């Protein structure tokens with residue numbers, strides 16, 4: 001493997017990470033109060049859970065995975081059309097909503113063993129969709145339907161979260177969820193998995209993420225122990241973001257997770273990252289604060305947070321360290 005992709009010794013994954021048997025799998029077709037209670041407990045104790053019987057069509061999930069895999073099978077000459085000035089874009093502000101191919105890593109500088117297609121999905125209009133990939137031919141039709149369905153499911157989950165916290169329904173149905181970035185991640189086979197990472201350990205910086213996977217590689221950090229997240233092809237993995245950790249005043253955990261490489265087979269995952277506009281002010285929900293529950297963060301600019309989150313990887317929560325109080 002090229003030295004560009006060699007992770008620092010301490011960040012390298014061990015070869016036998018055990019299955020996370022305690023990862024909650026929440027059936028959304030249970031009684032309403034049972035769903036609210038199970039989601040609440042998962043958010044409080046884990047910050048990562050799976051949802052099943054979630055009302056998003058299984059056929060649409062399969063068609064979206066198909067067209068995402070078809071995109072990454074396109075030849076070089078087509079993929080160049082999504083590389084600004086001949087190279088992949090970087091996860092840095094301003095983060096534009098038009099489709100680009102992205103490179104990612106840490107600055108002992110190294111790169112993640114990953115190609116990422118990213119674009120905005122909300123609101124859907126002619127201008128946004130016309131900035132999506134031209135190939136495959138059905139990408140725009142399928143991903144337009146997928147993005148609406150994934151948003152619908154995310155807003156259902158956020159309203160379950162509202163009921164669990166004692167916030168009014170629709171608390172997050174505003175500026176706090178106005179950005180919907182869809183990241184299609186391609187992990188080609190890696191000749192030295194012991195030295196590389198598909199994706200470094202991170203919180204998602206946004207509010208909430210729904211992740212679709214059909215192959216192993218996703219791992220979560222629990223009380224410095226890593227566990228493997230079982231791939232369920234018809235489920236969504238829910239990762240609570242650093243923004244939700246702040247707004248709930250740490251009553252909810254954020255999901256710290258990474259992706260390991262595979263020597264023999266490729267892997268495609270689809271992450272829908274919903275969260276605030278860059279103009280937003282983030283603070284602990286006033287409605288939940290008291291003398292017994294004082295705010296642990298001061299108000300901050302999401303744009304200012306974003307710049308630190310995307311550059312400083314000295315700690316998982318480096319993004320919010322400057323805003324910590326009490």
Ligand SMILES: CN1[C@@H]2CC[C@H]1C[C@@H](OC(=O)[C@H](CO)c1ccccc1)C2
Pocket residue numbers: 091095104179181183199202203204205206273275305306309310
């Ligand atoms: C694995 N990496 C992590 C998470 C996804 C991917 C790319 C990057 O995250 C983002 O670019 C998101 C886009 O919403 C972001 C940007 C600024 C603020 C909050 C969130 C870091």
Ligand SMILES: [O]
Pocket residue numbers: 204209271
């Ligand atoms: O992510």
Ligand SMILES: [Sr+2]
Pocket residue numbers: 080083086087088
């Ligand atoms: Sr190029």
Ligand SMILES: [Sr+2]
Pocket residue numbers: 130131132
């Ligand atoms: Sr175009």
Ligand SMILES: [V+3]
Pocket residue numbers: 202203204209239257271
């Ligand atoms: V993530």
